[PDB]
Amino acid sequence: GDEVRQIAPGQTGKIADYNYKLPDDFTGCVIAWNSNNLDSKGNYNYL
Amino acid sequence: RKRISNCVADYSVLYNSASFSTFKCYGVSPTKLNDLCFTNVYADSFVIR
16 A cells, blocks of 8 residues: 555656556556455465 | 765665665665765664654
């Protein structure tokens, strides 16, 4: 959840640089919502 | 206020360490810290709310 801010153009970080990178000129929309009642168990299937 | 001088500073480990809640740099890119260099570095450490 704390890595949501990294999904944005011009952003850098452990997520914004290694596994998911957006272009600096990205055009579009990003939509997120918590999945604490759906994905949380412990859920170790996400890496 | 602690003086840092006459040493080699490796900011890559500080950047990639996940123990920091916020690592945000203003006048310089965090990635480029390894290449360019300074006359001295100041580390003002304190605890607040």
